[PDB]
Structures are given as structure tokens and as C-alpha cells.
RNA sequence: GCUGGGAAGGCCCGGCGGGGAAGGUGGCUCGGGGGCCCCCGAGUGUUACAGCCCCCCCGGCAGCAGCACUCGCCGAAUCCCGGGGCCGAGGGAGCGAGACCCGUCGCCGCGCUCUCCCCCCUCGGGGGGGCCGGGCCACCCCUCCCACGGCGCGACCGCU
RNA sequence: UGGGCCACUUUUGGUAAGCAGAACUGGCGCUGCGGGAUGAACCGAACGCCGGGUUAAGGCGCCCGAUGCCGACGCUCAUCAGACCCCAGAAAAGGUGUUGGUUGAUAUAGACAGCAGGACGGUGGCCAUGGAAGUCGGAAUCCGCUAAGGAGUGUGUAACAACUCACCUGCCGAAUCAACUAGCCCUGAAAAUGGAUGGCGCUGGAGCGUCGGGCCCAUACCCGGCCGUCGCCGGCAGUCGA
RNA sequence: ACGUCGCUUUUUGAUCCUUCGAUGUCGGCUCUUCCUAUCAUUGUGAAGCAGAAUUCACCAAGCGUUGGAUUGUUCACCCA
RNA sequence: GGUUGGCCUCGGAUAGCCGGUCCCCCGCCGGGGUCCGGUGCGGAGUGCCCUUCGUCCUGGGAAACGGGGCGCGGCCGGAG
């Protein structure tokens, strides 16, 4: 049933803690609660990290366990996880949340106007579809 | 807040939910808990039934009619649990207790409304999956509740009506998605604004 | 190894109150001028003063 | 002795020079302590048991924190210790996995408290060695000596149970 | 200690197919179909072979008690396979010193009437579990045959009969009368 | 600022290497797989179609208890700015004119004028550079004493 | 005033006692306040009337101020669970519940467990005898063939017989066995009105052990206001605008 | 058996904390309730349980546990 | 005396979910089996809807099969 595993090379999104919002790669495993973790292209130096603040992604790099940061970074840049990650639905949901949080009063006003017009048009088309689908005279 | 907070009691742990509800009604909020027969208690059923039977044993030796009143409905059991966490012998605590309404099943006022959930009281997150638990409905039925069967039939009837409502809602949402892809040239201008400001990924 | 000189100055704070204090401790605290809780004073450290600090 | 996160201290001491031996031997100890005050106290506690030394009759010529030489390398630590139970005294060998010696010793103190109800004043660490995986003996440690180790995170418990406190949606566990 | 991974695999014969719906196993063979859910056990079940039909049970981060459930599930599934391919047949011999135990089989083998147990005038009526058929054998004299697909139900029905024929207020080491399970085998002997 | 004059780490495929292996890469063997070609599991072991650890003949560059949030103790080796809250007790401070309309007063820290040039904005106003000689330290030369630590060379004393 | 009493520790009589009697210091008496749900004595701290800040001991699911931390690591399931000085209930002894630890032993020259074969000959060894044949007993405890077998581990017979072991061997293919030890849990564990971790309740903990960061508030501490007492045996007769 | 660890407050002691400007002091009768350390009855397990009878133990206090001679008796003893 | 926009509802699982679509059965809609997507839930309660200065000239878009009726009359659904 499981599709994502903690393994050497697995890229994890850090959800909270000092490095919240960043991506890391799992380099080694210790004591079922922590992992050796190194994001060399996402500004996370090698350190222990609890699995509780990790959210496993779908990317898996290829390097041996406890290989040096040079090799982890080479594996990160080859098949560049930064661009692949930015392309995923997960990352753009995060981006939408961030840019909705930084919305100003003027932007909120403009969003309200645009949403008003969009919803009125959509509901007019919905009424049109319902009325068209109500013309049923069939055996 | 200013609206009535309706909570669905299914899958919630008795004392956790009661603590949350007691603090809410002490903060002046009106709380309605529905489906009190779906409330769970941690620990296996025999142990919890023994707790209730020990509660049944406590009665005034001189006059049991004056003694403690053991309410057998799940709603009244949960209500008494909340009363244990309220200061019910003061006017403030009594007002808090008056701001609480509990039901077995979901009566017609609240069966047409959206039901909230308290994650900090949910069995799924609060209890290890290897632990046993008891159903408040079964415990009440076996300590003397009389309406487990009729509430079950009424609940299944309500669930059939709710399934019909959900099918209509899904039909409307499919039609809305079709409308969105239909009127798109006249909509992409405002869609762009929403996407720019983080609504509507 | 360089062993630094043993410190010649101490700062002493009385951290307990004035209730139920044994007479010798009471006398030494009065000699240290700590008659109140959270009263501090400087103490020149030597054998005589250190053995007084050990009492209190 | 209480705790925190422990640090390792190299403490070097000796007896005061006397007109019997002008240059007494220097003794070095590894002390795992919250701070250097506790480290000096524990050093005197141990050398009073081993040699006939005292804080008054001796001096501490050095006390410095020993930084971990490889804090970025996973390793296995074997700890030999002795502790007082409620009914006797026992010697134990325990194994931990960590990046720092002081971190492993902190793990040992937490574990002794958890499993044996032993307090830090009862526990008495006497050897910490980085051992090889082939030399490890405890199965809990040995199960992590897998070059292709792989496991999911099965039952994720919701931890932000109060943000929000009330919500329509019941949480998801599978991820 | 929490073991990282404990898994066991069972092999499914060609003539029987297994379908997974979460932790619900559906085993369909020539003799019928069997349903059993294992939602009380937190394991993952996977079907691996399109050619040899392996079913694997994995338990991750299990302690002692919940590692004890992996082989329990595997053995239950093997019993399901055995039931849908060969079935289960429990033989019961009725033993008595003096009074012959008269067993008559009512509608479709689902009801058993014990008449003369230890000379009593009380008639014992034992109803078999659904999907279990009882009959009186022809090869042996005082022998009942219980046949079915679910080993749970078949052996529970056999226990119902055996405990129905129980001596009261007597030395049971001397009064040995009753109906006892003599053999637990299969049908079709394959 | 200090520390092991931090420990680790980054980059320079670190280069000439030497060695050790295993949580064993490739390869080889065996056993189960996808249409004799591509995977999974178990053995061989030393680089291979990955990597790890130690010693280097020696490292170099940047950064430096890091603004990639790995792990300290600090401030004569420490200063600047901001926000919230509570408060406003006191009431003749003048040594001076001989007070006169109400002591804008003492201690403390500063600025300008009683010198003259300039410079920049502004229509007289505002903002800046100063304006001559001394020492002391920074840089170069060689130069004394002392303290502390190390190393070596003796002469004396004590101790085999 | 000349009835004292209590607590740590020392200590005498007594089976013991919320018993009787001493030593030392502190306390209650004479004393409020924060905490211990409650309480003369325990823990913190001693008090004029107030504002602000901060603490102690103790706490922070709800009662009830404060953890609504994405707290850390483990242990533990109780059909009488457990839950904080004094303190308000338990022992010896047990457990193949689980978790750690110590020591020893067996095993790819094939362990362990299962299923499957053999388990002999001198010899029904001697003395005991009513019958004691390997198995009621007293000493002996050997030998040969062996892969191996005790002149016997137990059941059984009046005695035999017949089973069974320890002993070897086949299959099976990789780790296994034993004795201790001590954490939690369970057994041991029975009283009278109905009832008490304070209650509700709590089992990814609101339990137990080890730890972190925040946070709560005492009449305590700091800053300030006001009252009074005490001290400075303080100042002012200089109203001396000259 | 020798030993040893407990529980109970239906015995009797020990003590003197409450009550001496007074808590009516034995027994019986009457009546209610509670406990279980169960005599019987329900359901079980064990035996030196063949049956009958009996003994040990478990869940268990729902229901019951009587009529009399002697004695103030509580106790005791006998008849049934 | 309070209060200072509304949410008009699947069932639930949690070692799993949600949505959509083509064939079979149920009298034209659901239930299955494929298949296709999504899943740190975006068909998202960290969400959605409504969004209030008012009018007057005055264009373009949306609409124009449109809005407002304490206007009447009828019908249907809902019983916990
Ligand atoms: Mg005190
Ligand atoms: Mg089997
Ligand atoms: Mg009988
Ligand atoms: Mg810095
Ligand atoms: Mg004033
Ligand atoms: Mg006394
Ligand atoms: Mg008095
Ligand atoms: Mg006094
Ligand atoms: Mg007092
Ligand atoms: Mg108090
Ligand atoms: Mg108490
Ligand atoms: Mg205050
Ligand atoms: Mg409290
Ligand atoms: Mg609160
Ligand atoms: Mg107990
Ligand atoms: Mg009277
Ligand atoms: Mg009276
Ligand atoms: Mg009993």
C-alpha cells in the first residue's frame, strides 16, 4: 500500500523546524527516529533530522549511504531536483499559499472584484446548462 | 464565536471531547453535540461497562430516589461528563451548561447542517491503533438505554437522504466544472488575477 | 598546563528566606550582611571566608 | 547530577605538591556533564574513589570540552557502565547509534531512566567506545546495518491538533 | 525493540484466485468463495505474481505482540485456500458404554438431533454454522461427517456437538460417553 | 574576544600515493523475474561501469562558533535603534543685578561669537572644510632592561 | 509564665501505638499568606495601605490562572491499572506478559524443535525375598559390540511383559538453549451506608522514568506612591533684600 | 513439622485523643440494611470423584439460614 | 438585553482515501469491473459564498432564454 519510503537518496520536504520549507536528501538512517540529512543545493548543511518534521516527496537520488556532500550535490544537480520540484503540484500549492498570505489590501480588493465577475459568469453558464438539460421529453 | 458550533460525536473520545466542549461553553459559546452514540471511550468494552456498573452501584442507601441519577442515554452520559468538568453549582457554570445541547442521532434541526470535528479529541489521532475501545451506544444499550434500535433505523434513513443530497451536489459540481471549461475566453482575465494572488492554483 | 590563580573575589546572594534558620547559619549570614532573600554582597576569598561560605 | 544534553569534558587534575613528592602524577578523565562545574565535581568524585585524592588536597589543572571529531558520521557506541538498582549493583553493556559521543551518552542516561528507573546519581559511566558494525551485539542497533535500508512511515499522527481546533475534515493518516 | 520489517509470503495455486480489497481477502476456488477481513491487524497485503500468485504480508515497526500476527494472517489465508480447493471434513465418533447415542440429521444437514445420550430423555438439538453440512457416514457405524469450506465454522460446529454431549455430575474419567472429533482432514483427498 | 590560537565542514575531479576493509559498487556464480536481450534476492571481495575510513611528502583558497540556523562561553573583548505597560512623589535651586513680569537655576556633557579664509544649497538664511605648533602609536632602521614559557651549554649542592 | 505539643536526626521502655520518656535545632502555641483538594506543626515564605514587574514551593486537559510546544527518548494494558514529601494502605513468594542486562552452553564435523528408525549382549548383575527381572530398597556405576544405549528418566505389572526417556541415527536446512538478574504489569490482595489519584475523566498519555523551552501567581523579592514608628540627641532663633 | 511473610478489627489487652454545666450503661424482643472470610441453592473445576455420599477450590451475597427444654445471659448445651 | 455577514447536510477509511469516465445489472438513475486523474487533501473549513458610500452624464464588456415582488393562486418535498 505504501508508495514512499525512507531510503538513501529520498528527497524530503521539511515541514517545520529551523529548516522549514526546504528540501533535503536522506543520506543515512539512525535509530528509527532520525536521519542524516543533507541538502547541498537547498542550503541545509549535513545534520541529524527527526522523521517527524519530514514529508517524503516522490524524488529519489542515487548515491551510496554516507557519501560526501560533493557526491550528494552532484546527484542533486544531475536530474535537477530544484526544477522538478518547482514543477510539481505540491510546490505550486505551497507557492499559492505564500502569495495569498502576502496579499495586500489593494490586492484583496482587486481579487474580490475579479472573483465577483468570475462567479457571476460561471453561475450564469451553470443556469444555462441546467435549463438546457431540463428539456427532456423521451420515452 | 457567534454561531452555534455543531460537533459530530462519532469517532471522538469521551473525556477529550468533553473537555473541549466544556471550555467552549464556559467561553460563552453555544455548542451542539450530535450522534452521542458514536462517541468512543478508550479501554476495552468490559472494562468500561464495569466502570458504568460501579457508577450504577452508587445510590443513596436511605433514598435512592434522592440519590445519584444514572442517565442511560449516550447523550445524557456525555452531558453528565461535561457537567463534571463545569462548575455547575454556580450561576456561571449553570449558564455554561445551558449553552450545551446533546442528541442521540442527528435530529432534523442539525441533520441539514455541516458538522464539525475536533481533531484533538479524535480516536484516530489520540489512540494507538493497537488499543481497544468501547462504543458509547453499545455501553448505553447494555446498561439500560432503550432506543438503540430505533435510533439506528432513523440514522440509516437519514443516511439515505444524505446520500441523495450528496449525489445532487456532485452533479452540480460536475456541471460547474463543465461551465468553467465552457465560458473560458470570457473568464481567463479574472482567472489570471486569482492565480496571480494565490487563489485557484 | 597553565593553572590560573584561584579567584580572590566572590559575589554571594542569599537565596533562601529567613524562616526556620539554624543559629550558626543565621550568625554567618548576618556576618556576611545577607539578612534578606536576594541580598548580594562581595566577599574577599580566603580560607577564613571560604569556610564561612561552606557553613551557609 | 541532573541532565540536559550532556557534553564531554577532559578533566586533568593532580595532588598539590608537598615536601614528599614535588611533582605528583597528572590524572586525566572523561566526564559527561551538563557544564564544567558539574564536570569538576564529578572528576573529584571519581578520583576520590580511585586514588586517595581530594578537592582540598588537589587541584584541577585542566577542564575543557572535547568536541566530537566526526559529528557528521553515523557511528555505533558501546557503553560500559555500572549502576545501583534498588537491590544491588550491576554492570551493563549498552549500544547506541549517534553522531556524537556526548549524544550517545545522553541517550544512555535517558534509556537507563526509561528502562531501569535509574537516576543519574546511580549511573556511573566507565567506558565509551566507537565500535564497528560487525562488532555490535544489540539487535536494535544491528538492524540499521543495512546498506539498502528502506522503510515507510506507516501511521502518521496529526500533531497540529489545535491548529485548527475545530474543522470539518477528519485528518488523514496515510501519506 | 521495534523490528524494521517482518514479512511472510504464501503461494496461491493456479486453480484458485485471490482478490484484495484493502485488508479484506477474497479467495475464490472450485469449491466456492471465502471472505475474511483483517482490519483488526495493521499490516500491508500485496499480490505479487501474475504467474505464480504470491501474497505477501508485511508489518513495519512491529513489536513482539504484533509481529506475532504476520504468520497468523498467513495461516488463515492458507486455510482459506485449502477450504476453497479441498474443503474441510471433520469426522466425529460417538463413543458410549451402554446407551447407544442416536444421532439423526434434520433439514439439509444443518440440524443434529442427539437422542439417547447416556440414556437421557432430553433431546439435544445442535444447529450447525451456515455453510457447514453434517451427515452420518456409511463407512463407519457411529460416525458423523462435518464438511464445509470455512475451517472456523466447521470446527466450531464440531465443538458445538462435542460440548453438547457432556456428562454432568459424574466422574468423566469413568463415564466417557460423548461425541468426539476423531479426524480433521479434507475432502477430495488431493 | 577566547578555545585544540575552536571541532567538523565547503571548494580546488587535490594531487604522488600507501593501507584497511564492509552496512559490498561494478563484475562473476547461483536462485526467482520483464520480449539469448533488461530487473529482484543470496554468495566472491577490495575499484572495477559507486562509494567509505586511516596515514600523508605536503596541502592551497574562501569562510570562520557562519547571513547554508551542526555543536559553546563571553563583552573595559559592546554599542545603536524601536515597541508595550505602570508611574509624575517633590515645589523659594538666584552669594547675583543690590533681584522687581514667572530664579529657562546648580553639577555634568556639548555648540557658536568676540580670528580669517574658503566650499555647497538657498534670498539675508541653512549646511560643511578648517586656520599653527607639539607629543604617542602605525611603517622602516638598530636598540636597552625586565617578566613569563621552552630549548641547549656549563659551574656548585643534594640524591646512586 | 512555671499543663505544652509537633517535625528532621540521635535515642530509652514497649509487639506496637496519633504510646510513654530524653538530646539538638526549628516550628505550632502567639501566625496570617502561596502550595499540599481538605488539615495547628509539611514545602515556600513571614504580614503597614496600594500600583507595576519578577519569583519561591507548586503547577499548566476541564473544574482552575498557566504547554492550544507540530516538546525529546523509552516503558506499560490492569475483567481490583497508575498517577507526586509528611500522607493517609501492603509483604514474603510467584509469572513461558513484555523490556533491558549478566553468565554459561550447543551449532554447516548439521544445532533447537518437530515427524521418523534403533534404544543391545554378559545380565533375571550382588545383597536383600513371599515377588521384586533397569524402575520399593543397600552398596557398588563395570565390560564387549558398537553410530549409540543408564547393569537405567518415568508410566506400568503381584512379578514379567508392554510403553517411555538419555543415547545415537534419518529428514529438515540456520542460528539456538539454559540459569540468573531487575524495570513496568499481573497473581498473592477479604468487611461491613454508596464513593473517591480532590472530581470529571485520561490509555499516540491527562500513566511511569529521564530531560528541554515557554508560561501561571504569594502579603516573598525589586521600583514607585502614601501612613506610622524608630534613627540621624539631624536642620531652622540668620525674618540677615543685604 | 521446623521456620518465615501477611491480613482482620466480630476477642482480649495496650493507650488516654474526644466526652464528667451527663452521648441513658447488659441481654432479649422488634425491624431495616450492609459485608463475605459461602452453610444451602444456580453454574463450574479437582479428588485417594465407579454410583450414592463426601472433601477441596472458583464465579457468586439473588434467595434462605427455623421450632423448643435449662439459663438474665451474650456464650453454652441438648431435643427436633 | 444580547449581537455586529452567511455556509442549505455523503457515508466513512486511517497499513489508506477522493474525483471522473467506458462495458454488465437495477426501471431513464444508481451498484460493480475496467480505465484515467488527484493525494501533505486545491472538487482544499489553512476552504467556499456574499461583499454596503449613493447618485448623475457616459462608453465598452457580462447578460439580454435577465432581475425585484412582506402581489396573488396552485402544486411538491420534509414527521426524529
Ligand atoms: Mg521552611
Ligand atoms: Mg500450520
Ligand atoms: Mg457422584
Ligand atoms: Mg557570530
Ligand atoms: Mg508634583
Ligand atoms: Mg512524646
Ligand atoms: Mg495557651
Ligand atoms: Mg515568636
Ligand atoms: Mg506562621
Ligand atoms: Mg494554603
Ligand atoms: Mg492530600
Ligand atoms: Mg504584585
Ligand atoms: Mg492544580
Ligand atoms: Mg485555563
Ligand atoms: Mg495491585
Ligand atoms: Mg441527654
Ligand atoms: Mg441520645
Ligand atoms: Mg469470594
Taking the centre of ligand 3 as the mean of its atom positions, its distance from the CA of residue E170, in whole angstroms, is 5
Q: What is the DSSP letter of D169?
A: S
8 A C-beta contact, residue E154 and residue E132 = yes
8 A C-beta contact, residue D108 and residue D94 = yes
The Cβ of residue D132 has, within 10 Å, a number of other Cβ atoms equal to 10
8 A C-beta contact, residue B117 and residue B17 = no
Please state how this structure was obtained.
Answer: cryo-EM
Distance E42 CA to I17 C1' (A): 16
Q: Which of residues 27-46 of B touch strand G (CB under 7 A)?
A: 41-44, 46
- Residue A1: CA count within 13 A, CB half-sphere: 18
SS (H, E, C) chain B: CCCCEEEECCCEEHHHHHHHHHHHHHCCCCEEEECHHHCEEECCHHHHHHHHHHHHHCCCCCCCCCCCCCCCCHHHHHHHHHHHHCCCCCHHHHHHHHCEEECCCCCCCCCCCCCEECHHHEHHHHCCCCCCEEEHHHHHHHHCCCCHHHHHHHHHHHHHHHHHHHHHHHHHHHHHHHHHHHCCCCCHHHHHHHHHCCCCC
Q: Alpha carbon of B169 to those of B115, B144, B162, D168: distances in Å?
A: 17, 40, 10, 17
List D64's β-bridge partners, or say none. Answer: D10
Chains contacting D (3 or more CB pairs within 8 Å): A, B, C, E
| CA dihedral for D172, E1, E4, E9, sign (positive or negative) | negative
Residues with Cβ within 8 Å of residue E177, at least 6 apart in sequence: E95, E96, E97, E99, E101, E117, E118, E165, E167
Taking the centre of ligand 2 as the mean of its atom positions, its distance from the CA of residue D37, in whole angstroms, is 63
Find the angle CA(D9)-CA(D13)-CA(D19) to the nearest 5 degrees. 175
Interface check A125 vs B, CB under 8 A: yes
Residues E117, E119: Cα–Cα separation, whole Å = 5
Listing from the earlier edge strand, what are the strands of the sheet with E143-148?
E132-136, E143-148, E88-95, E178-185
Burial class of residue B12 in the structure, from the number of CB atoms within 10 Å of its CB (0-12 exposed, 13-18 middle, 19+ buried):
buried
Find the angle CA(B47)-CA(B52)-CA(B54) to the nearest 5 degrees. 95
For residue D133, how far is the Cα from the chain centroid? 19
Name the residue closest to the C1' of G45 by its CA: C17
Interface check B130 vs E, CB under 8 A: yes
Q: Would strands A34-39 and A44-50 be described as parallel, antiparallel, or unpaired?
A: antiparallel
- Asked if strand G contacts D54 at the CB level, meaning under 7 A, the answer is no
With an 8 Å Cβ cutoff, are A32 and E2 in contact? Answer: yes
Residues B105, B38: Cα–Cα separation, whole Å = 9
8 A C-beta contact, residue E70 and residue E6 = yes
Q: What is the dihedral of CA D113, D116, D119, D120, to 10 degrees?
A: -70
Interface check D145 vs A, CB under 8 A: no
The Cβ of residue E27 has, within 10 Å, a number of other Cβ atoms equal to 25
Q: Alpha carbon of D119 to those of A98, D79, D80, D90, D91: distances in Å?
A: 48, 17, 16, 14, 15
For residue C17, how far is the Cα from the chain centroid? 15
Q: H or E stretch including E66?
A: helix E64-67
- Is residue E128 helix, strand or coil? coil
Instruction: Show residues of chain A in contact with D144, CB under 8 Å.
Output: 29-32
8 A C-beta contact, residue C10 and residue C32 = no
Residues A77, A63: Cα–Cα separation, whole Å = 12
Instruction: Show residues of chain E in contact with B124, CB under 8 Å.
Output: none
Listing from the earlier edge strand, what are the strands of the sheet with D75-84?
D89-98, D75-84, D124-131
With an 8 Å Cβ cutoff, are E61 and A32 in contact? Answer: yes
Residues with Cβ within 8 Å of residue D136, at least 6 apart in sequence: D76, D78, D95, D142, D145
Task: Give per-residue burial for B44-82: e unless 16+ CB within 10 Å, then b.
Answer: eeeebeeebeeeeeeeeeeeeeeeeebebbbbbbbbbbb
Burial class of residue C23 in the structure, from the number of CB atoms within 10 Å of its CB (0-12 exposed, 13-18 middle, 19+ buried):
exposed
Write out the residues surrounding ion ligand 1, Cβ under 5 A: C 20
Angular region, D38: left φ>0, alpha ψ -120 to 50, beta rest: alpha
Residues E18, E25: Cα–Cα separation, whole Å = 7
**Can you point out the beta strands (E) in E51-171?**
54-62, 88-95, 103-105, 111-114, 124-127, 132-136, 143-148
Helix residue spans in chain D (DSSP H) = 36-50, 101-116, 139-142
Residues E80, E74: Cα–Cα separation, whole Å = 10
Q: Which residues of chain C are at the D interface, by a Cβ-Cβ cutoff of 8 Å?
A: 1, 3
| CA dihedral for A56, A59, A63, A69, sign (positive or negative) | negative
Burial class of residue A53 in the structure, from the number of CB atoms within 10 Å of its CB (0-12 exposed, 13-18 middle, 19+ buried):
middle
The Cβ of residue B96 has, within 10 Å, a number of other Cβ atoms equal to 26
- Is residue E155 helix, strand or coil? helix
Residues B93, D70: Cα–Cα separation, whole Å = 61
Instruction: Show residues of chain C in contact with D12, CB under 8 Å.
Output: 1
With an 8 Å Cβ cutoff, are E66 and B129 in contact? Answer: no
Residues E164, E117: Cα–Cα separation, whole Å = 10
Q: Would strands B100-102 and B31-34 be described as parallel, antiparallel, or unpaired?
A: parallel
Residues D170, D152: Cα–Cα separation, whole Å = 22
Q: H or E stretch including E73?
A: helix E70-85
Residues with Cβ within 8 Å of residue A61, at least 6 apart in sequence: A9, A10, A11, A25, A72, A75, A76, A79, A81
Residues B146, B152: Cα–Cα separation, whole Å = 12
For residue A99, what is the nearest residue in chain B, using CA coordinates?
A: B198
- Asked if strand H contacts E170 at the CB level, meaning under 7 A, the answer is yes
The nucleotide minimizing the C1' distance to residue B61's CA is: G193
Residues B6, B115: Cα–Cα separation, whole Å = 5
List B65's β-bridge partners, or say none. Answer: none
CA distance B193 to chain A (A): 7
8 A C-beta contact, residue E57 and residue E43 = yes
8 A C-beta contact, residue D39 and residue D11 = yes
CA distance C3 to chain D (A): 5
Q: Alpha carbon of C46 to those of C6, C32, C49, D31: distances in Å?
A: 10, 14, 5, 29
Chains contacting C (3 or more CB pairs within 8 Å): D
Q: Alpha carbon of D86 to those of D82, D118, D119: distances in Å?
A: 13, 9, 11
Residues E153, E147: Cα–Cα separation, whole Å = 10
8 A C-beta contact, residue A119 and residue A127 = no
For residue D135, how far is the Cα from the chain centroid? 20
With an 8 Å Cβ cutoff, are E66 and B130 in contact? Answer: yes
Q: Alpha carbon of B67 to those of B56, B58, B89, D17: distances in Å?
A: 11, 8, 17, 83
**Can you point out the beta strands (E) in E63-131?**
88-95, 103-105, 111-114, 124-127
Closest Cβ opposite residue B182 in set A97, A118, A125? A125
**Can you point out the beta strands (E) in chain A?**
6-7, 10-14, 23-30, 34-39, 44-50, 54-60
Find the angle CA(D75)-CA(D81)-CA(D83) to the nearest 5 degrees. 140
Deposited resolution, Å: 2.6
Q: Would strands B31-34 and B5-8 be described as parallel, antiparallel, or unpaired?
A: parallel
Burial class of residue E107 in the structure, from the number of CB atoms within 10 Å of its CB (0-12 exposed, 13-18 middle, 19+ buried):
exposed
Burial class of residue A138 in the structure, from the number of CB atoms within 10 Å of its CB (0-12 exposed, 13-18 middle, 19+ buried):
exposed
Q: What is the dihedral of CA B25, B28, B30, B35, to 10 degrees?
A: -10
Residues E81, B109: Cα–Cα separation, whole Å = 51
Amino acid at each position: 500500500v505504501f508508495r514512499r519510503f525512507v531510503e538513501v537518496g529520498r528527497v524530503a520536504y521539511v515541514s517545520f523546524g529551523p529548516h522549514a520549507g526546504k528540501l533535503v536528501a536522506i543520506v543515512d538512517v539512525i535509530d528509527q527516529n532520525r536521519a542524516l540529512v543533507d541538502g547541498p543545493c537547498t542550503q541545509v548543511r549535513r545534520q541529524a533530522m527527526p522523521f517527524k518534521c519530514m514529508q517524503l516527496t516522490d524524488f529519489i537520488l542515487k548515491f551510496p549511504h554516507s557519501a560526501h556532500q560533493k557526491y550528494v550535490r552532484q546527484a542533486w544537480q544531475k536530474a535537477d531536483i530544484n526544477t522538478k520540484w518547482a514543477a510539481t503540484r505540491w510546490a505550486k500549492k505551497i507557492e499559492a499559499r505564500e502569495r495569498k498570505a502576502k496579499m495586500t489590501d489593494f490586492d484583496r480588493f482587486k481579487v474580490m472584484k475579479a472573483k465577483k465577475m468570475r462567479n457571476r459568469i460561471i453561475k450564469n453558464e451553470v443556469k444555462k446548462l441546467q435549463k438546457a438539460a431540463l428539456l427532456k421529453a423521451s420515452p | 464565536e457567534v454561531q452555534v458550533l455543531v460537533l459530530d460525536g462519532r469517532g471522538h473520545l469521551l473525556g477529550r471531547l468533553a473537555a473541549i466542549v466544556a471550555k467552549q461553553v464556559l467561553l460563552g459559546r453555544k455548542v451542539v453535540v450530535v450522534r452521542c452514540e458514536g462517541i468512543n471511550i478508550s479501554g476495552n468494552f468490559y472494562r468500561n461497562k464495569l466502570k458504568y456498573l460501579a457508577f450504577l452501584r452508587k445510590r443513596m442507601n436511605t433514598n435512592p430516589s434522592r440519590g445519584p441519577y444514572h442517565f442511560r442515554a449516550p447523550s445524557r452520559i456525555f452531558w453528565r461528563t461535561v457537567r463534571g468538568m463545569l462548575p455547575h453549582k454556580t450561576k456561571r457554570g449553570q449558564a455554561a451548561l445551558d449553552r450545551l445541547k446533546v442528541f442521540d442521532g442527528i435530529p432534523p434541526p442539525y441533520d441539514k447542517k455541516k458538522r464539525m470535528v475536533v481533531p484533538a479529541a479524535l480516536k484516530v489521532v489520540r489512540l494507538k491503533p493497537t488499543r481497544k475501545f468501547a462504543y458509547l451506544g453499545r455501553l448505553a444499550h447494555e446498561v439500560g438505554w432503550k432506543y438503540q434500535a430505533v435510533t439506528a433505523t432513523l440514522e440509516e434513513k437519514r443516511k439515505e437522504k444524505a446520500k441523495i443530497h450528496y449525489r445532487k451536489k456532485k452533479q452540480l459540481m460536475r456541471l460547474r466544472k463543465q461551465a468553467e471549461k465552457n465560458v473560458e475566453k470570457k473568464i481567463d482575465k479574472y482567472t489570471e488575477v486569482l492565480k496571480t494572488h494565490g487563489l485557484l492554483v | 598546563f597553565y593553572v590560573p590563580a584561584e579567584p580572590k573575589l566572590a559575589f554571594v546572594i542569599r537565596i533562601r528566606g529567613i524562616n526556620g534558620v539554624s543559629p550558626k547559619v543565621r550568625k554567618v549570614l548576618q556576618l556576611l550582611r545577607l539578612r534578606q532573600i536576594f541580598n548580594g554582597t562581595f566577599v574577599k576569598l580566603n580560607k577564613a571566608s571560604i569556610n564561612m561560605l561552606r557553613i551557609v | 547530577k541532573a541532565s540536559g544534553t550532556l557534553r564531554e569534558y577532559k578533566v586533568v587534575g593532580r595532588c598539590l605538591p608537598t615536601p614528599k613528592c614535588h611533582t605528583p602524577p597528572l590524572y586525566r578523565m572523561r566526564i559527561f556533564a551538563p557544564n564544567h562545574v558539574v564536570a569538576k565535581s564529578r572528576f573529584w568524585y571519581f578520583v576520590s574513589q580511585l586514588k586517595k585524592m581530594k578537592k582540598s588536597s588537589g587541584e584541577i589543572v585542566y577542564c575543557g570540552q572535547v568536541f566530537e571529531k566526526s559529528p557528521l558520521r553515523v557511528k555505533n557506541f558501546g557503553i560500559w557502565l555500572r549502576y545501583d538498582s534498588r537491590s544491588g549493583t550491576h554492570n551493563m553493556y549498552r549500544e547506541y547509534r549517534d553522531l556524537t559521543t556526548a549524544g550517545a551518552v545522553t541517550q544512555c542516561y535517558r534509556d537507563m531512566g526509561a528502562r531501569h528507573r535509574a537516576r543519574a546519581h546511580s549511573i556511573q559511566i566507565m567506558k565509551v567506545e566507537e565500535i564497528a558494525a560487525s562488532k555490535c551485539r544489540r539487535p536494535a542497533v544491528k538492524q540499521f546495518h543495512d546498506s539498502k535500508i528502506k522503510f515507510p512511515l506507516p501511521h502518521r499522527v496529526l500533531r497540529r491538533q489545535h491548529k485548527p481546533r475545530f474543522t470539518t475534515k477528519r485528518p488523514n493518516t496515510f501519506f | 525493540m521495534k523490528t524494521i520489517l517482518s514479512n511472510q509470503t504464501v503461494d496461491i495455486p493456479e486453480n484458485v484466485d485471490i482478490t484484495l480489497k484493502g485488508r479484506t481477502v477474497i479467495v475464490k476456488g472450485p469449491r466456492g468463495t471465502l471472505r475474511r477481513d483483517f482490519n483488526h491487524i495493521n499490516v500491508e497485503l500485496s499480490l505479487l505474481g501474475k504467474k505464480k500468485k504470491r501474497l505477501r504480508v508485511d508489518k513495519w515497526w512491529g513489536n513482539r505482540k504484533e509481529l506475532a500476527t504476520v504468520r497468523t494472517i498467513c495461516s488463515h489465508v492458507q486455510n482459506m485456500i485449502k477450504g476453497v480447493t479441498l474443503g474441510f471434513r471433520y469426522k466425529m465418533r460417538s463413543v458410549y458404554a451402554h446407551f447407544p447415542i442416536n444421532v439423526v440429521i434434520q433439514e439439509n444437514g444443518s440440524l443434529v438431533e442427539i437422542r439417547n445420550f447416556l440414556g437421557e430423555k432430553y433431546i439435544r438439538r445442535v444447529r450447525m454454522r451456515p455453510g457447514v453440512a453434517c451427515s452420518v457416514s456409511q463407512a463407519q457405524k457411529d460416525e458423523l461427517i462435518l464438511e464445509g469450506n470455512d475451517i472456523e465454522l466447521v470446527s466450531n460446529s464440531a465443538a458445538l456437538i462435542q460440548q453438547a454431549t457432556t456428562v454432568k455430575n459424574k466422574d468423566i474419567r469413568k463415564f466417557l460417553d460423548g461425541i468426539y472429533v476423531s479426524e480433521k482432514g479434507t475432502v477430495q483427498q488431493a
